[PDB]
Amino acid sequence: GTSNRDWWPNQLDLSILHRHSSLSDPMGKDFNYAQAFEKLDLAAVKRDLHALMTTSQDWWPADFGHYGGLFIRMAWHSAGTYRTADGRGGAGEGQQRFAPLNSWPANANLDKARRLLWPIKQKYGRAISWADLLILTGNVALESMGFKTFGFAGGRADTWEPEDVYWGSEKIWLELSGGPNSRYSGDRQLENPLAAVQMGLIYVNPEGPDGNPDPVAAARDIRDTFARMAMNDEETVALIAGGHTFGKTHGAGPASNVGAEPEAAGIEAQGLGWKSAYRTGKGADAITSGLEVTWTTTPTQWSHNFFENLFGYEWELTKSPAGAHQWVAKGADAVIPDAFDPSKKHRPTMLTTDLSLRFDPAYEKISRRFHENPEQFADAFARAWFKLTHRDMGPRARYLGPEVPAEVLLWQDPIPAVDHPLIDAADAAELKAKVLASGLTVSQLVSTAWAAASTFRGSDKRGGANGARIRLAPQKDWEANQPEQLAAVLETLEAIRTAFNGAQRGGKQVSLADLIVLAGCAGVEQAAKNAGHAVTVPFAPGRADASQEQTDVESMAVLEPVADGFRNYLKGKYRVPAEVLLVDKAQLLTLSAPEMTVLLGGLRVLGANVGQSRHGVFTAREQALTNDFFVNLLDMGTEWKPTAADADVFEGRDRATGELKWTGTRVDLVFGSHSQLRALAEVYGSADAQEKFVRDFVAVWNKVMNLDRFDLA
Amino acid sequence: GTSNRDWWPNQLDLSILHRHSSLSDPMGKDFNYAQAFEKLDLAAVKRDLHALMTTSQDWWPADFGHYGGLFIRMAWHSAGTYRTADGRGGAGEGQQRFAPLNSWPANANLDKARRLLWPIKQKYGRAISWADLLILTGNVALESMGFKTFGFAGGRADTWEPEDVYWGSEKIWLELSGGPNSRYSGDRQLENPLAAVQMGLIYVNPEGPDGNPDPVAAARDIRDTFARMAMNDEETVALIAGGHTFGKTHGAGPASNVGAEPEAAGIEAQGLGWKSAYRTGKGADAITSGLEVTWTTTPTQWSHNFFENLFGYEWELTKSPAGAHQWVAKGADAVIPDAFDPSKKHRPTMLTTDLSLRFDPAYEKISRRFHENPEQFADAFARAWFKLTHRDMGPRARYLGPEVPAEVLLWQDPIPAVDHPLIDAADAAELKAKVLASGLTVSQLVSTAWAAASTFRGSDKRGGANGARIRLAPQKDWEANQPEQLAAVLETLEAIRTAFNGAQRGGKQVSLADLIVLAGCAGVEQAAKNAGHAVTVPFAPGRADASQEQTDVESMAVLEPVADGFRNYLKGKYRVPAEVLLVDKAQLLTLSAPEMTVLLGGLRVLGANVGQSRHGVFTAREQALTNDFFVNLLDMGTEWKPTAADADVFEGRDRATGELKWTGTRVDLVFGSHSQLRALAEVYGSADAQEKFVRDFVAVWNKVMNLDRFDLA
Ligand code: HEM
Ligand code: HEM
Ligand SMILES: NNC(=O)c1ccncc1
Ligand SMILES: NNC(=O)c1ccncc1
Ligand SMILES: NNC(=O)c1ccncc1
Ligand SMILES: [Cl-]
Ligand SMILES: [Cl-]
Ligand code: NA
Ligand code: NA
Question: Coil, strand or helix: which one is B336?
Fold first, then answer.
């Protein structure tokens, strides 16, 4: 059945903005997962999960009688898809249970893992999400095998359809680099936003780069991909060695025995996949990755045996029973237990990527320190495991339950507590009047608040105006933020703040974060008055100001907008067309298509463009809040053509005279081209729509200003 | 970016159920188009449209100084995509403005026509939908040129995204038949549900079948396709001859001069397409279809000159300037005006398909009658044009405005007015108890109401329980409806009805349509009580009973369910898998995925399966409303395998003993296989879900009962 995507495969896709509707959600519109979770008997769940660890099912028998390694890998993979570039992936939406991730080759046989959890899921129902359950199970596996975790927070609400994520352009699972859709160019440069080396892998290839078994070169891929997942060297070594303290790999026969992944399997498979024709197809005969490695002498118990083995033997290249490259300890005795036969023992073995921890010189130093100081290793792995499994949860205010660690961690972009009375409505009116009396313009006020608030992304719930980080490095220096203009606005706002705060009694004060937002609100109010309209913009105080020392500058870099269509900004020339980048940004902001449309048309007339560019400024009353953008864009009296100098800039001329009336970018003109966007533009550019435009703009502005306000949830 | 559809291109697509969310709609949740339209000054709109007809724009100059022909074609094409097989297509949602229809080759240059109407649309805003305006414009065109229309109803609310419609499997526009995705098999049998001969055409090819200029053979295609759009021979001849009384075709140079369709065009084209490099690219130089025919001596005025020409000349095969086959009048004088040069005249010309109206023997009889009796022609055309343009509007209760025809037409499936007081809540409780005391079972009551209500389809708003057509031919004899069982239930309910109506005073009575629905309600209440749960199912009276004489039996044939997964029914063996047909039925019913899931699992346990099949009846308390379907389907203690006898029937055995527990079809087991459906099944199969399951089942039951109740809007 031929679809619009088949006919016009390069047209923009707006359905990514209308996922996660109330239509596909089985829960009622008022369901609130946090409230459900807070009444869950978490201790009861943990007891059931402990019991499960050794309750082997015949359809997927437990290695060593204990499912803890399988479950650790399950949780690691749930979290392991995360990319710092866009915040997409990670454990926080339980997406491992949907396509494509439920069928990625690196997630083979995790379908078995999730099915073993169904009885617990069923028993507790809506009070524990899948997303929370996958991580809790990994924690219980660790605790059951003798490792004390750093903590756990609930609050990951389940989702109900697959997320629209760019995982790459390859059309073959696991394709090696340098193909027609290669994710690598130049000197092994991985394309942003990807954080895995091959399609369907989590980070790297366990046999080495493109399957070449060189631990030193593997190390380079490990370092690059783990950095793209927010992990530094210490955290990376801790996580790999910690993980591989447990369990084993599965490669008992040739891979050709393994059948269809879950999304390809027959209906009778009931949601499972990778059925194997090799012997019994399971247990001792299991095939997952094709490798056949067991790292430690006690795979079901926390030990220091990983680094004893890594450093205590020399390693020889060998092949598993499926033909994959792996390593075996030279001259060693058979000390590693077998998973099923108490009469068999094995020599120590390692993956290429485990050997990276010894043969990359930076990792070796860390590995050696962990080998000599196992308490340091345990602590580092506990912290890293917490970070891994919570990286996408957002502000600490979202963290639920009795096991939430009290320690504030720098990676959480922490916001200080508020310990003083907040400004009330009379105070807000007094501060808005002061801001308008200062001489700051509508353009300056709107631009500044936009800059502050629009760093939010719902993928990992980082960013937003809380914290006033726009005043800190590195946000204050970002090109999109107009550093010189920004500094002049912030100086004026800090002077208003100081004067207000110095007049108060009783401990009342206003944060700069709140004042930035409030000042933006006053700009929008002033713009509405400029257009003849009496409008009140909602404001909620309670933001606090974070310090520079609470703001990791390197972690903040990935929130820099290199493309922000809402300010007609593109930092460089990219291969993805700018209107696709606009839709991607709207998706991070949580905006629907109508919201994206009204927001952009209003920002253009308020003067929010970077550098005061006239591109898309289709009005003769800039700084007045009108629907002019739409009325003019849709005027058939104007003809548009790309310029000679630049095919991405367009000139709009009077059709009868040839006279130039406007210029615009692709982001501007897509609203007049795309057949669904133009239908939305037409609503706002109709003669009956001015009041609707204003009230919808105010709503979407307020939505953006509050995106990170989980303190008010 | 590789997507799930790329990896698993045969997986079922649930997004067709989650279109039209409040996310994509720019109007507020409380917007009601009928309320807006009812205050529109329709007379004023029509005056503006009359003026537009002769106000040429230079970017697409008006033929003969009058846009009326263009607008009639535009309205015909808006309505012309309709297919009776599924009710999809038609003018009722304004879909011509979205992909793919906005870029179909048969819709070339209607982009121009729609752009000409933006100033009117913009002036009247939300009070007139695009969908209504396209039709209204065609009627104003006709009236402006001296044709008296049969009337007009508003009420087509605008939609905001493309509908998911199967338009064929070809991958090339206009592909001729007999390719690898041919829509024809056997002796020119067009595949259901299609109603056009080539991808991107409305009905037929104007040169003749696959381009062969044989009017007799073309007639066959005309007849078959028009019948698939609900038009008989008289209506067909009236429409084609009526339409081709006006305007002209456009084929002034070779087609290779015409560029990209709108969805493919550059951003600068601002939603227009087919830009032509031939001479001026417009007006006298226009190329649309590649044919160059003008039918009448007065292309801007109603006449009977089409038939005077068709019958008054003999016709010679010729080629247009673009190379297309067309016909010209032998020996004729130059009597047809030129569209732009008042000093040029032309010979009469015809399409192959016009000549069909004379050379097909059945058409010739009708055409000759219309030629001798142009008043008969005018009346048939007016009636046919109203039917064409209103065919998908639904019940007459949806028809809005001051020009609705008072005549009730048989094709409307009319419902008599109610002229008596309705039963109240106490009466409804008395009737439910009488029904339960009769001895009718939960299964009989649920199955009968299901059968009556589930003929609704939201594509053209036909069907539903209003009318009590289930008691009439042909519904009473449809296999899915279990004719002997149904007859028994209807007899019992008619005796209840007689006894209740005969005891009343004051004219109060209950219709059989209402009592069928109410009885189903009593069944669902009784099932809930069987499960230990007291619930009240909502009921709204006011349906009426239609007569056999008010029921077109042949038109009702297309509403027969040949596949109804909700009753585990498949009338024959089809190429599309049964799970895909389920989702298609759910889309017709207007159900979301959650709604489809609850509804099916509840129907299975209430005994709604046709023939009392055990397939999917995963309960030991049939006729009790419980979640047992979900809990049993999802039990990993059961293993499923296709049977030897039938690969589409599955046996569920205990995994440890081999004992047979259940049997199921693909429709049952898809809820345990598909990863999004299984996620829904898990919510209703959880230990906390009994209350939710009952509540949600009652809500979707009541939704289905009320689908055709536009009298309550
Ligand atoms: C360079 C990064 C890594 C690579 C290439 C890698 C590779 C693999 C492979 C190939 C398997 C075997 C799959 C099978 O055949 O069953 C595996 C198993 C496992 N991995 Fe990793 N791993 C990485 C990092 C991690 C990390 C960060 C964790 C967790 C903290 C982890 C925990 C596990 C555990 C517990 C198993 C055993 C599974 C079982 O017992 O069933 N791994 N790893
Ligand atoms: C067998 C069915 C039909 C065929 C094959 C057909 C074919 C065509 C073609 C090839 C054109 C020229 C497109 C262009 O080059 O501009 C056209 C024009 C037109 N058709 Fe039809 N048509 C059919 C039925 C109808 C019907 C049912 C109506 C309306 C009741 C209609 C009304 C018109 C009008 C008004 C025009 C002239 C447009 C103008 O002046 O711009 N047609 N037809
Ligand atoms: N822990 N990571 C894995 O299990 C894995 C990585 C690459 N191919 C298969 C599995
Ligand atoms: N693909 N996932 C995200 O982009 C996301 C999820 C939730 N809200 C904003 C963005
Ligand atoms: N009235 N129908 C048309 O305009 C048409 C039919 C087939 N190809 C192009 C245009
Ligand atoms: Cl995601
Ligand atoms: Cl449709
Ligand atoms: Na994420
Ligand atoms: Na329809």
Answer: strand
CA atoms of A385 and A76, how far apart (whole Å) = 8
> Could you list which residues have their CB under 5 Å from ion ligand 9?
B 90, 392, 459-460
* A97–B673 CB contact, under 8 Å: no
Q: Which residues pair with A326 in a beta bridge?
A: A318
Q: From residue A80, give the alpha-carbon distance in Å to each of A14, A101, B1.
A: 27, 11, 20
Residues of A with Cβ-Cβ distance to B17 under 8 angstroms: 23-24
Q: What homologous superfamily does CATH list for B168-372?
A: Peroxidase, domain 2 (1.10.420.10)
**Is residue A97 within 8 Å of B675, Cβ to Cβ?**
yes
* DSSP one-letter code for B244: T
B614 to chain A, minimum CA–CA distance in Å? Answer: 18
Distances (CA, A) of A689 to A604, A686, B97: 17, 5, 21
Q: Which residues of B are catalytic?
A: 77
Rounded Cα–Cα distance for residues B510 and B528 (Å): 25
With tokens 């060593």, the residue in question is A64
B66 contacts chain A (CB < 8 A): no
**Residue A194 near ligand 3, beta carbon < 6 Å:** no
CATH classification code of A565-688: 1.10.420.10
From ligand 4's centre to the CA of A462, what distance in Å? 11
Q: Strands of B325-329's sheet, edge to edge? A: B315-319, B325-329, B349-350
Distance from CA of A556 to the nearest CA of B (A): 27
Query: A465 to chain B nearest CA, in Å?
Result: 25
Cα separation, B699 vs A524, whole angstroms: 43
A200 CA distance to ligand 3 centroid (A)? 10
Assess if CATH 3.30.300.20 describes domain B1-167+373-407. no
For chain B, domain boundaries: 1-167+373-407, 168-372, 408-564+689-713, 565-688
Please report which helix (H) or strand (E) contains residue A481, including its range: none
Give, for B569, the enclosing helix (H) or strand (E).
strand B569-570
Measuring CA to CA, which residue among A4, A329, A330, A192 is closest to residue B261? A4
Q: What CA–CA distance (Å, rounded) separates B398 from B458? A: 13
Instruction: List phi, psi (to 5°) of B512.
Output: -65, -30
Distance CA B621, CA A484 (A): 74
Neighbours of B443 (CB within 10 A): 18
Contact B336, B346 (CB under 8 A): yes
- Catalytically annotated residue among A18, A50, A66, A77: A77
User: Which residues contact ligand 1 via a Cβ below 6 A?
Assistant: A 63, 69-70, 72-73, 76, 203-204, 206, 222, 239-240, 242-244, 246-250, 288-289, 291, 353
> Is domain B408-564+689-713 classified as CATH 1.25.40.10?
no
Alpha-helical regions (H) of B260-400: 305-312, 352-359, 361-372, 374-390
Q: Which residues line ligand 2 (CB under 6 A)?
A: B 63, 69-70, 72-73, 76, 203-204, 206, 222, 239-240, 242-244, 246-251, 288-289, 291, 351, 353
**Ligand 8 centre from A87 Cα, in Å?**
5
Distance CA B228, CA B196 (A): 9
* Whether the domain at A408-564+689-713 and the domain at A565-688 fall into the same CATH topology: no
The binding-site residues of ligand 5, defined as CB within 6 angstroms of any ligand atom, are B 73, 76, 106, 201-202, 206, 289
Nearest residue by C-alpha to atom 6 in ligand 3:
A106
Task: Using alpha carbons only, give the angle A25, A26, A31 rounded to the nearest 5 degrees.
Answer: 85
Ligand 1 atom index nearest CA of A245: 35
| Structure tokens, B464 | 């539903």
Among residues B432, B430, B431, B629, the alpha carbon closest in space to that of B529 is found at: B432
Question: In angstroms, rounded to a whole number, what is the distance separating the alpha carbons of residues B638 and A503?
Answer: 73
Residue A653 to residue A657: CA distance in whole angstroms: 8
Experimental technique behind these coordinates: X-ray
